[PDB]
Amino acid sequence: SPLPKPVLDTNGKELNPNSSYRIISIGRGALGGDVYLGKSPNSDAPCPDGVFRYNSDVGPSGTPVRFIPLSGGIFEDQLLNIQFNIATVKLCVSYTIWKVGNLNAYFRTMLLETGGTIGQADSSYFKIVKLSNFGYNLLYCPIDNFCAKVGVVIQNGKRRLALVNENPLDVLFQEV
Amino acid sequence: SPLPKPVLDTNGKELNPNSSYRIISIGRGALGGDVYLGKSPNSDAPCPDGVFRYNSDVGPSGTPVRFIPLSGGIFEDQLLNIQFNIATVKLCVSYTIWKVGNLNAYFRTMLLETGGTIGQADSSYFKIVKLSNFGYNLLYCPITPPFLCPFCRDDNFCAKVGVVIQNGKRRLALVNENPLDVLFQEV
Numbered sequence: 001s002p003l004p005k006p007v008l009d010t011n012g013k014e015l016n017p018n019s020s021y022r023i024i025s026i027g028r029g030a031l032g033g034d035v036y037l038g039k040s041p042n043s044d045a046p047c048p049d050g051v052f053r054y055n056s057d058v059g060p061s062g063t064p065v066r067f068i069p070l071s072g073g074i075f076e077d078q079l080l081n082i083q084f085n086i087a088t089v090k091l092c093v094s095y096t097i098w099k100v101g102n103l104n105a106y107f108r109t110m111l112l113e114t115g116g117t118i119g120q121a122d123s124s125y126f127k128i129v130k131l132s133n134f135g136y137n138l139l140y141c142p143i144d145n146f147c148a149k150v151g152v153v154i155q156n157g158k159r160r161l162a163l164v165n166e167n168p169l170d171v172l173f174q175e176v
Numbered sequence: 177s178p179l180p181k182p183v184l185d186t187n188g189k190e191l192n193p194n195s196s197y198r199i200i201s202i203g204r205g206a207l208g209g210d211v212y213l214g215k216s217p218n219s220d221a222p223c224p225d226g227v228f229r230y231n232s233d234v235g236p237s238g239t240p241v242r243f244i245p246l247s248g249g250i251f252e253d254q255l256l257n258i259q260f261n262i263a264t265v266k267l268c269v270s271y272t273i274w275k276v277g278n279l280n281a282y283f284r285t286m287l288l289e290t291g292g293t294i295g296q297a298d299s300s301y302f303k304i305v306k307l308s309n310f311g312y313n314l315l316y317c318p319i320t321p322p323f324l325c326p327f328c329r330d331d332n333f334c335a336k337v338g339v340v341i342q343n344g345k346r347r348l349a350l351v352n353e354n355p356l357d358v359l360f361q362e363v
């Protein structure tokens with residue numbers, strides 16, 4: 001019985017819902033590459049709708065996000081929505097909001113997408129956990145409580161975030 | 177346009193339409209204060225609609241913006257729209273986009289607001305220029321006749337963007353003199 005612990009950014013500050021963070025990797029160079037909003041393949045969607053991370057961190061920085069906790073603050077092991085915190089055209093507002101996709105028969109998993117909703121019964125909820133001595137992991141939780149770890153599959157040469165069983169993605173939160 | 181000059185951020189790097197910048201003050205201390213999206217008192221907008229700067233740089237950092245040229249890249253003396261680069265609800269998307277308000281007969285000028293459009297005939301276009309030899313200034317540049325604008329004189333009827341004190345807050349606004357001197361810090 002430990003009690004709720006705050007998530008901390010790379011500066012050691014508690015995550016604030018009114019701030020923006022890049023989700024960066026544990027690794028540097030070739031193992032680096034921040035999370036970003038990109039275009040998927042075989043995607044009907046009118047807007048960018050894939051959640052990816054870069055193939056190395058020697059290039060662009062990630063797309064910032066905010067965390068919308070269901071009730072109150074950003075704490076470990078607590079449900080929240082995640083949304084890329086940038087301006088889009090009216091059409092694409094939905095497509096900043098993280099969502100888990102339909103089970104993809106080739107990968108035999110669900111890939112992370114955008115196009116969901118904030119704070120509803122149909123929304124995709126995630127939690128931030130410390131499964132490790134350094135950094136955090138993201139889990140997807142429907143409706144401990146039957147969650148799934150987020151990691152990466154390789155899709156058209158890109159790092160596509162997806163649900164996995166082993167090697168989840170280790171991340172830190174870098175205030176923007 | 178004696179060869180076209182890209183606008184540079186605080187690292188000397190050319191500004192890009194797909195990055196975000198904070199608009200920061202140039203002076204530090206009490207002269208400091210980044211641009212932010214704030215709630216206007218005396219506005220019935222359904223979302224915050226005021227372009228302000230903080231009263232010193234000890235407070236929060238500014239609301240990031242992106243620059244959206246009418247055409248092409250980001251260059252000095254070239255028309256662009258400006259938008260605070262943040263997620264909002266659908267009804268509030270407009271209120272990330274910079275525009276010039278109507279004549280405020282009390283301040284005897286127009287206040288900078290959000291509520292605008294991007295890349296249309298009705299959009300509020302601005303330019304990034306170099307008046308003083310350190311940092312940049314913003315101008316508002318009417319693309320139709322500014323019947324209503326007191327300070328739309330300069331050259332092409334462009335007006336200097338500066339600051340007025342509204343409920344003890346620095347509110348951006350068209351000024352006759354003392355333009356706001358700004359640097360762009362990549363987010």
Ligand SMILES: *[C@@H]1O[C@H](CO)[C@@H](O)[C@H](O)[C@H]1NC(C)=O
Nearest residue numbers: 059060191192193194195249
């Ligand atoms: C910004 O926009 C260009 C437009 O083609 C795109 O290739 C790129 O992702 C971005 N980066 C740079 C450095 O231009």
